[PDB]
């Protein structure tokens, strides 16, 4: 909570969690605590802090419980994952086997695996937002997430699978906040679920209306089964701590694959109707792949992009608008392609980019995604051929959807698909390992 | 209400200093000499432990911590443990 | 303490009013002083012998109270005295 | 009245300044630029007519009148009319649009045929034709031509680029990026007839008057900005560019507007700007359908920012949806769909700023970057008179870029474009002398870049200048200035060394071009000598007199110097810098026209003080008051800055001024001595017969030779020095002492033995040389150095002892050498403690003698030493004893002011208004006065780090006179001495002193 504002905990939250631990005896109850704490408080943390709390809590238990020879062995390993020190731990035939299995992960240069090792060693069911929500006994929730994704669509399937009653409420202008406060007071009486999209932007209002409103509503417990959800962004405006502590917290850490995002981009595109050429749907397909390829690169940094850049459904919209316009103003001849790349790579997407290093990367992506005669081959496995002479627009949608359904995303996707090298991905895996390993050592010595 | 911030003038009211008279009891505050009742009471309240109070005050003042610490957790988990471990003796 | 006057307090017109009042008291005591310099040096010398400053610092460890002892003026013209703890006998 | 509305139009229009009547009828309007627009129909007025009614007609007619002047003109050029013809009869806004439409039409067809070359020369000729027209033109139409030139250059540039394309697809790509100005030869609603295409997107020219604004040079970067702005607007989104200050983001939005016939309203945000006013202006912009730019939006206060940001969303959300009416400021107001909001985002200390969350899905953020300079350079060369503008622009930039990679990373070095604009600015007068050739560019490189370089980098410049382009063998103004410079220095006392000639030349050539000059160097480099020598040489060569005002910048407050206003009575009194200008500007009663005025700032320069004058450093050449005025500065009036360091000053401040970096001291150790001697002899002529003088100057020359001293000064460095000062600055201390010690024994030089005379001379010189190099030394080191002096001086010559002294009789002229004789002290019980009691030691007498000798020289003294070492008493007792000098004691504290020094002096000093020095400040009694400043290294320094109290003493020591803080006049102090005591600055509490002050002090470590 000291590192991040959203990572708060009250004493009462720990007490209520420890009560659930009941409803060598001392040794078993101890093991019951560590598990129940990992179970409830893992949910309000992001993937980095999940891994940090895993490795820490593992050493918090095993240093008291196991041998002194165990202690320096695992610590000389956590030192190798970090840049503190490199060593081979003290080796004894059959002496330790779980610990001997761990060093095998670290020595195989496999980083992500060694970090998740401590999670599996808790032997806990890592609770799905649904399970957490179901267990949770409050009508309020705030789920923050990185700007790459939004759990808005996870909440749709969460409501559909149990209790329905989904109401999405954007907080936009006076109208949205004004309609919003009306739909809030009426939904609690009705008992319907409610969602408050991206509160952070409308925050000034929160401290005046929502902060008082949620505080006053102790009759919301009395009111019909109803649940209110709020979406935040972790990188972003800091929510009032008092409102935050009162409300339950989750971090949506669910990142879609390249192919999955392509399929999700292309999916809506049929809802727009038909206003353009058959040929255009091919360019809209091209953009679908492109957008899903830069977004995939966005997370991989520094190796990959120099900084975290955020790309939107607005960036797709501004790109597709330019594409409709170029096909509308030119002939159906393929060659318009030259200034299609320039305008996409420098104004539409290169706009936010400020570093020259990264501007070249957006261009080199357009080089491959846009210019392409007869065969494109976006990824190693998948080839996209240009529209057939038959010129069926309904067939081509179905053909381009079919090309997605044919492919299955490989193991090595981040290096094979995003044309960046494998050795860069490992360099990145190493660094996020180092960050988890460091912050844990820091935590142990502090107490 | 704000003990962290504290002006000098209260000062004679913190140290028990007075100028006694036939019936009246006077205390000097900054300039004016004002009469003390005796039905009068003083409490100083602070919210943040981070904020440091003057050595003058800290020495004349009875510092009491109403703080729900991490130490308070050890005390309070035993009460919850014993209610679920030996309910007969926690009742008695 | 470095000088025995604060220059700023008595400057300009307030220097002239001081200078006037100074001549009054000097003569009352029974001494007239030829020059403007002869006068001021009486004034300063009077302060040096009638004003007495005692500092009471509690924690010399404090950075603001360290600045007291640091200050050259105070350090040279003060008598530093130590009472920092009560001994077991005095307790 | 009606005519009184013209004042308020400037506000509600932006382009126009005042309106033109025939009283009953409105004949037209004139712009803030000076351009006169006449309407088609003159609008009729009667007394009982409302402003709202008549003005509303004017807004309509003002736009129509622009279409008329546009179609009239466009049609003319289409009918093969030279652009020089059109300029004279059509308003700029009109002619600009006409050019654009015809250009676009002519190039559109030229992409098909590929007849680029035929059109190119054609355009190039119109450019040259416009250029020569400009030279012979009236100032008003001078603006119009220049504004058009910016455009015609753009035209030809694009065509040339188009000529060069590998294929036709390449040409159609390049053309798509450009802003293409089309007209509809189809249709009615003429105001809506002109539209603009770019990146495939179209944008209707609204017909608003723009007047004749300063038009930005077209860069690829500019077009890209225009392209992002058009891409956001096409999808009904707000334009937003973030980036570092000085990247011209608002200027862009201003220009993007102009190109489309729109006067953008710019809100400078947080210049103490009210929310209530902005809220009004926002309603007006949504009604009138205008473009608003938020200039530096980031700088708003959180309460304001919330409120404003929410409002802006209304507008941009209203547009995206297209709502006819939107509610903002809790009222139903209608929304024009022509409305747009632009946000420029300067960065904070933390990072490049962001838009508030709500605005993030309402705006489109873009990154402004400084222009790659090559493109700017080529155009600038084109305008002046090109020769080969393309080759120079490539070559200049390569060279500047090359210097940057090849020189040392030094603080004040800027090889950014600012610098090339400056080379180019300096180039124009240079072209007058030589050619619109590279050679004139070459010279301008070395006129600007070279005076700021230091020796290692000085060759890198020369090596790579010839490596990139070689121009010429010989220089103009080579003989003539130089003999006027040699003649001035011979007269001043100075020696024309490699370096002193060089830095004198560098300076001469700069005053020509630059009006603000900076001289940076170590204390005792030669600056005061360089400028005082050059300025003197110009009165010989031109015949123009100079009027110099040397002001210590940081001794006085911004209020004492620029002009101080009093918060309540708002009573305005002059200051110092502003008051000396009013002599030249307000009332040039005597001869100022033919004179050259120089205002020198000798003290360290800081942001706060230069910012309060930045307008004179600007292309403006006018002084802006805190309240009340702008005073313009003539071409005679030059501002110089001599200082020791720059660390505080901004790169922006440097690049407005001409910078002259003194890498090393102008002059040789010997040459310094030479001048110093003669300077000392001149003082003596006023108080010594020529026969005496002639003989004594002969003595000095034959006793000490440079060959011996060279080792002595070298060995001085191999020694631990308390209160360190460099060898070169210690020199004045030797010669001033030495000459005084010999002029001391002048009478006994009449009858004494010629071999014995040399021994008296050599001893004194060996002595004076000791305290000047080793006086601030341990004395354990002094003793060691004494042998070092003896070593390097002639072996036979009278050797130095620790306490060595020269003695003469009480009652008879005599001569013998005896040392260390002491009077013996008996004091009573009551006497024991007293602020004035000395028990004399072998060493008390030793110090008291030397200390007294230095004052006879009248050189300032710094007695540095530990507490209780007796530095105060030695000073006090040597002077409490003598009738000549009288002591005045000031103690310094961490924060003591320069007025305390004055007030303490006023007690013992009497100003006399003698016509000889005007005001003077001698002591209140006849014989000499001594200020004793105790704890001189105690007063603290500006946050920049500059102790003014010390600089004030330095003013008294060097200048010998100071400027009055309230009354604003020069008072020259007569016969007053500065002596100081301080502790070693290794001690706590202590502040490091400026070499620029300690250079005028003799330092004795006791």
CSV table of N, CA and C in Angstrom, one decimal, chain D residues 280-379:
chain,number,residue,atom,x,y,z
D,280,UNK,N,-16.9,32.8,-20.6
D,280,UNK,CA,-17.6,33.7,-21.5
D,280,UNK,C,-17.1,33.4,-22.9
D,281,UNK,N,-15.8,33.5,-23.0
D,281,UNK,CA,-15.1,33.3,-24.3
D,281,UNK,C,-15.4,32.0,-24.9
D,282,UNK,N,-15.6,30.9,-24.1
D,282,UNK,CA,-16.0,29.6,-24.6
D,282,UNK,C,-17.4,29.6,-25.2
D,283,UNK,N,-18.3,30.3,-24.6
D,283,UNK,CA,-19.7,30.4,-25.2
D,283,UNK,C,-19.6,31.1,-26.5
D,284,UNK,N,-18.8,32.2,-26.6
D,284,UNK,CA,-18.6,33.0,-27.8
D,284,UNK,C,-18.0,32.2,-29.0
D,285,UNK,N,-17.1,31.3,-28.6
D,285,UNK,CA,-16.4,30.5,-29.6
D,285,UNK,C,-17.4,29.5,-30.2
D,286,UNK,N,-18.2,28.9,-29.3
D,286,UNK,CA,-19.2,27.9,-29.8
D,286,UNK,C,-20.4,28.5,-30.6
D,287,UNK,N,-20.6,29.7,-30.4
D,287,UNK,CA,-21.6,30.4,-31.1
D,287,UNK,C,-21.1,30.9,-32.4
D,288,UNK,N,-20.0,31.7,-32.4
D,288,UNK,CA,-19.3,32.3,-33.6
D,288,UNK,C,-18.6,31.2,-34.4
D,289,UNK,N,-18.5,29.9,-33.9
D,289,UNK,CA,-17.9,28.8,-34.6
D,289,UNK,C,-16.4,28.9,-34.9
D,290,UNK,N,-15.7,29.6,-34.0
D,290,UNK,CA,-14.3,29.9,-34.1
D,290,UNK,C,-13.4,28.7,-33.5
D,291,UNK,N,-12.1,28.9,-33.7
D,291,UNK,CA,-11.1,28.0,-33.2
D,291,UNK,C,-10.4,28.6,-32.0
D,292,UNK,N,-10.3,27.9,-30.9
D,292,UNK,CA,-9.7,28.3,-29.7
D,292,UNK,C,-8.5,27.3,-29.5
D,293,UNK,N,-7.4,28.0,-29.1
D,293,UNK,CA,-6.2,27.2,-28.7
D,293,UNK,C,-6.0,27.5,-27.3
D,294,UNK,N,-5.8,26.5,-26.5
D,294,UNK,CA,-5.3,26.6,-25.1
D,294,UNK,C,-3.8,26.5,-25.1
D,295,UNK,N,-3.2,27.7,-24.9
D,295,UNK,CA,-1.7,27.9,-25.0
D,295,UNK,C,-1.1,27.5,-23.7
D,296,UNK,N,-0.4,26.4,-23.7
D,296,UNK,CA,0.2,25.8,-22.4
D,296,UNK,C,-0.9,25.5,-21.4
D,297,UNK,N,-1.8,24.6,-21.8
D,297,UNK,CA,-3.0,24.2,-21.0
D,297,UNK,C,-2.7,23.6,-19.6
D,298,UNK,N,-1.5,23.0,-19.6
D,298,UNK,CA,-0.9,22.3,-18.5
D,298,UNK,C,-0.9,23.2,-17.3
D,299,UNK,N,-0.5,24.5,-17.5
D,299,UNK,CA,-0.3,25.4,-16.5
D,299,UNK,C,-1.6,26.0,-16.0
D,300,UNK,N,-2.5,25.2,-15.4
D,300,UNK,CA,-3.7,25.7,-14.8
D,300,UNK,C,-3.8,25.3,-13.3
D,301,UNK,N,-4.6,26.0,-12.4
D,301,UNK,CA,-4.8,25.5,-11.1
D,301,UNK,C,-5.9,24.5,-10.9
D,302,UNK,N,-5.7,23.4,-10.1
D,302,UNK,CA,-6.5,22.2,-10.1
D,302,UNK,C,-8.0,22.5,-10.1
D,303,UNK,N,-8.5,23.5,-9.3
D,303,UNK,CA,-9.9,23.8,-9.3
D,303,UNK,C,-10.4,24.3,-10.7
D,304,UNK,N,-9.6,25.2,-11.3
D,304,UNK,CA,-9.8,25.8,-12.6
D,304,UNK,C,-9.8,24.7,-13.6
D,305,UNK,N,-8.7,24.0,-13.6
D,305,UNK,CA,-8.5,22.9,-14.6
D,305,UNK,C,-9.6,21.9,-14.7
D,306,UNK,N,-10.2,21.5,-13.5
D,306,UNK,CA,-11.3,20.6,-13.5
D,306,UNK,C,-12.5,21.2,-14.2
D,307,UNK,N,-12.9,22.4,-13.8
D,307,UNK,CA,-14.0,23.1,-14.3
D,307,UNK,C,-13.9,23.4,-15.8
D,308,UNK,N,-12.7,23.8,-16.3
D,308,UNK,CA,-12.4,24.1,-17.7
D,308,UNK,C,-12.5,22.8,-18.5
D,309,UNK,N,-11.7,21.8,-18.1
D,309,UNK,CA,-11.6,20.5,-18.7
D,309,UNK,C,-13.0,19.9,-18.9
D,310,UNK,N,-13.9,20.0,-18.0
D,310,UNK,CA,-15.3,19.5,-18.1
D,310,UNK,C,-16.1,20.2,-19.1
D,311,UNK,N,-16.0,21.5,-19.1
D,311,UNK,CA,-16.6,22.4,-20.2
D,311,UNK,C,-16.2,22.1,-21.6
D,312,UNK,N,-14.9,21.8,-21.8
D,312,UNK,CA,-14.3,21.6,-23.1
D,312,UNK,C,-14.9,20.3,-23.6
D,313,UNK,N,-15.0,19.3,-22.7
D,313,UNK,CA,-15.7,18.0,-23.1
D,313,UNK,C,-17.1,18.3,-23.7
D,314,UNK,N,-17.8,19.2,-23.1
D,314,UNK,CA,-19.2,19.5,-23.6
D,314,UNK,C,-19.1,19.9,-25.1
D,315,UNK,N,-18.2,20.8,-25.4
D,315,UNK,CA,-18.0,21.3,-26.8
D,315,UNK,C,-17.5,20.1,-27.7
D,316,UNK,N,-16.5,19.5,-27.4
D,316,UNK,CA,-16.0,18.3,-28.2
D,316,UNK,C,-17.0,17.1,-28.2
D,317,UNK,N,-17.8,16.9,-27.2
D,317,UNK,CA,-18.8,15.9,-27.2
D,317,UNK,C,-20.0,16.3,-28.0
D,318,UNK,N,-20.3,17.6,-27.9
D,318,UNK,CA,-21.3,18.2,-28.7
D,318,UNK,C,-21.1,18.1,-30.2
D,319,UNK,N,-19.8,18.3,-30.6
D,319,UNK,CA,-19.4,18.2,-32.0
D,319,UNK,C,-19.4,16.8,-32.5
D,320,UNK,N,-18.8,15.9,-31.8
D,320,UNK,CA,-18.7,14.5,-32.2
D,320,UNK,C,-20.1,13.8,-32.5
D,321,UNK,N,-21.0,14.1,-31.6
D,321,UNK,CA,-22.5,13.8,-31.7
D,321,UNK,C,-23.2,14.8,-32.7
D,322,UNK,N,-22.8,16.0,-32.7
D,322,UNK,CA,-23.4,17.0,-33.6
D,322,UNK,C,-24.6,17.7,-33.0
D,323,UNK,N,-24.8,17.6,-31.7
D,323,UNK,CA,-25.9,18.2,-31.0
D,323,UNK,C,-26.0,19.7,-31.4
D,324,UNK,N,-27.2,20.1,-31.8
D,324,UNK,CA,-27.5,21.5,-32.2
D,324,UNK,C,-27.2,22.5,-31.1
D,325,UNK,N,-27.7,22.2,-29.9
D,325,UNK,CA,-27.5,23.0,-28.7
D,325,UNK,C,-26.8,22.1,-27.7
D,326,UNK,N,-25.8,22.6,-27.0
D,326,UNK,CA,-25.2,21.9,-25.8
D,326,UNK,C,-25.2,22.8,-24.6
D,327,UNK,N,-25.3,22.2,-23.4
D,327,UNK,CA,-25.3,22.9,-22.2
D,327,UNK,C,-24.0,23.0,-21.5
D,328,UNK,N,-23.5,24.3,-21.3
D,328,UNK,CA,-22.3,24.6,-20.6
D,328,UNK,C,-22.5,25.9,-19.8
D,329,UNK,N,-21.9,26.0,-18.7
D,329,UNK,CA,-22.1,27.2,-17.7
D,329,UNK,C,-23.6,27.2,-17.3
D,330,UNK,N,-24.2,26.1,-17.1
D,330,UNK,CA,-25.6,25.8,-16.8
D,330,UNK,C,-26.7,26.7,-17.5
D,331,UNK,N,-26.5,26.8,-18.8
D,331,UNK,CA,-27.5,27.5,-19.7
D,331,UNK,C,-27.4,26.7,-21.1
D,332,UNK,N,-28.6,26.7,-21.8
D,332,UNK,CA,-28.7,26.2,-23.1
D,332,UNK,C,-28.2,27.2,-24.2
D,333,UNK,N,-27.0,26.9,-24.7
D,333,UNK,CA,-26.4,27.7,-25.8
D,333,UNK,C,-26.2,26.9,-27.1
D,334,UNK,N,-26.4,27.5,-28.3
D,334,UNK,CA,-26.3,26.7,-29.5
D,334,UNK,C,-24.8,26.5,-29.9
D,335,UNK,N,-24.6,25.4,-30.6
D,335,UNK,CA,-23.2,25.1,-31.0
D,335,UNK,C,-23.0,25.0,-32.5
D,336,UNK,N,-22.2,25.9,-33.0
D,336,UNK,CA,-21.7,25.8,-34.4
D,336,UNK,C,-20.8,24.6,-34.6
D,337,UNK,N,-20.9,24.0,-35.8
D,337,UNK,CA,-20.1,22.8,-35.9
D,337,UNK,C,-18.8,23.1,-36.6
D,338,UNK,N,-18.6,24.4,-37.0
D,338,UNK,CA,-17.3,24.9,-37.3
D,338,UNK,C,-16.3,25.1,-36.2
D,339,UNK,N,-16.8,25.1,-34.9
D,339,UNK,CA,-16.1,25.2,-33.7
D,339,UNK,C,-15.0,24.1,-33.5
D,340,UNK,N,-13.9,24.4,-32.9
D,340,UNK,CA,-12.8,23.5,-32.5
D,340,UNK,C,-12.0,24.1,-31.4
D,341,UNK,N,-11.5,23.1,-30.6
D,341,UNK,CA,-10.7,23.4,-29.4
D,341,UNK,C,-9.3,22.7,-29.6
D,342,UNK,N,-8.3,23.5,-29.4
D,342,UNK,CA,-6.9,23.1,-29.5
D,342,UNK,C,-6.1,23.2,-28.2
D,343,UNK,N,-5.4,22.2,-27.8
D,343,UNK,CA,-4.6,22.2,-26.6
D,343,UNK,C,-3.1,22.0,-26.8
D,344,UNK,N,-2.3,23.0,-26.4
D,344,UNK,CA,-0.9,22.8,-26.4
D,344,UNK,C,-0.4,22.5,-25.0
D,345,UNK,N,0.5,21.5,-25.0
D,345,UNK,CA,0.9,20.9,-23.7
D,345,UNK,C,2.4,21.0,-23.5
D,346,UNK,N,2.9,22.1,-22.9
D,346,UNK,CA,4.2,22.2,-22.4
D,346,UNK,C,4.6,21.2,-21.3
D,347,UNK,N,5.9,20.8,-21.2
D,347,UNK,CA,6.1,19.7,-20.2
D,347,UNK,C,6.4,20.3,-18.8
D,348,UNK,N,6.2,19.5,-17.8
D,348,UNK,CA,6.5,19.9,-16.4
D,348,UNK,C,7.9,19.5,-16.0
D,349,UNK,N,8.3,19.5,-14.8
D,349,UNK,CA,9.6,19.0,-14.3
D,349,UNK,C,9.6,17.4,-14.3
D,350,UNK,N,8.4,16.9,-14.1
D,350,UNK,CA,8.1,15.5,-14.0
D,350,UNK,C,8.1,14.8,-15.4
D,351,UNK,N,7.5,15.4,-16.4
D,351,UNK,CA,7.5,14.8,-17.7
D,351,UNK,C,6.7,15.7,-18.6
D,352,UNK,N,6.6,15.1,-19.9
D,352,UNK,CA,5.7,15.7,-20.9
D,352,UNK,C,4.3,15.6,-20.4
D,353,UNK,N,3.5,16.7,-20.3
D,353,UNK,CA,2.2,16.7,-19.7
D,353,UNK,C,1.2,15.8,-20.4
D,354,UNK,N,0.0,15.6,-19.7
D,354,UNK,CA,-1.1,14.8,-20.2
D,354,UNK,C,-2.4,15.6,-20.2
D,355,UNK,N,-3.3,15.1,-21.0
D,355,UNK,CA,-4.6,15.7,-20.9
D,355,UNK,C,-5.4,15.1,-19.8
D,356,UNK,N,-6.3,15.8,-19.2
D,356,UNK,CA,-7.2,15.2,-18.1
D,356,UNK,C,-8.0,14.0,-18.7
D,357,UNK,N,-8.4,13.1,-17.9
D,357,UNK,CA,-8.9,11.8,-18.5
D,357,UNK,C,-10.0,11.9,-19.5
D,358,UNK,N,-11.0,12.8,-19.1
D,358,UNK,CA,-12.2,13.0,-19.9
D,358,UNK,C,-11.8,13.4,-21.4
D,359,UNK,N,-10.8,14.3,-21.5
D,359,UNK,CA,-10.4,14.9,-22.7
D,359,UNK,C,-9.6,13.9,-23.6
D,360,UNK,N,-9.2,12.7,-23.0
D,360,UNK,CA,-8.4,11.7,-23.7
D,360,UNK,C,-9.2,11.0,-24.9
D,361,UNK,N,-10.4,10.8,-24.7
D,361,UNK,CA,-11.2,10.3,-25.8
D,361,UNK,C,-12.0,11.4,-26.6
D,362,UNK,N,-11.5,12.6,-26.5
D,362,UNK,CA,-12.1,13.8,-27.1
D,362,UNK,C,-11.1,14.5,-28.0
D,363,UNK,N,-9.8,14.3,-27.7
D,363,UNK,CA,-8.7,14.9,-28.4
D,363,UNK,C,-7.7,13.9,-29.0
D,364,UNK,N,-6.8,14.4,-29.8
D,364,UNK,CA,-5.8,13.5,-30.4
D,364,UNK,C,-4.4,14.1,-30.2
D,365,UNK,N,-3.6,13.4,-29.4
D,365,UNK,CA,-2.3,14.0,-28.9
D,365,UNK,C,-1.2,13.7,-30.0
D,366,UNK,N,-0.4,14.8,-30.2
D,366,UNK,CA,0.7,14.7,-31.1
D,366,UNK,C,2.1,15.3,-30.5
D,367,UNK,N,3.2,14.7,-30.9
D,367,UNK,CA,4.5,15.1,-30.4
D,367,UNK,C,5.3,16.1,-31.2
D,368,UNK,N,5.3,17.4,-30.9
D,368,UNK,CA,6.1,18.4,-31.6
D,368,UNK,C,7.5,18.2,-31.3
D,369,UNK,N,8.4,18.4,-32.3
D,369,UNK,CA,9.8,18.2,-32.2
D,369,UNK,C,10.5,19.4,-32.9
D,370,UNK,N,11.7,19.7,-32.5
D,370,UNK,CA,12.4,20.9,-33.1
D,370,UNK,C,12.6,20.5,-34.6
D,371,UNK,N,12.6,21.5,-35.4
D,371,UNK,CA,12.7,21.2,-36.9
D,371,UNK,C,14.1,20.7,-37.2
D,372,UNK,N,14.3,19.6,-37.9
D,372,UNK,CA,15.6,19.3,-38.5
D,372,UNK,C,16.0,20.6,-39.3
D,373,UNK,N,17.1,21.2,-39.0
D,373,UNK,CA,17.4,22.6,-39.3
D,373,UNK,C,17.6,22.8,-40.8
D,374,UNK,N,18.2,21.8,-41.5
D,374,UNK,CA,18.6,21.9,-42.9
D,374,UNK,C,17.6,22.7,-43.7
D,375,UNK,N,16.3,22.3,-43.6
D,375,UNK,CA,15.2,22.9,-44.4
D,375,UNK,C,15.0,24.4,-44.1
D,376,UNK,N,15.1,24.8,-42.8
D,376,UNK,CA,15.0,26.2,-42.4
D,376,UNK,C,16.2,27.0,-43.0
D,377,UNK,N,17.4,26.5,-42.8
D,377,UNK,CA,18.6,27.1,-43.4
D,377,UNK,C,18.6,27.4,-44.9
D,378,UNK,N,18.1,26.4,-45.7
D,378,UNK,CA,18.1,26.6,-47.1
D,378,UNK,C,17.2,27.8,-47.5
D,379,UNK,N,16.0,27.9,-46.9
D,379,UNK,CA,15.1,29.0,-47.2
D,379,UNK,C,15.7,30.3,-46.8
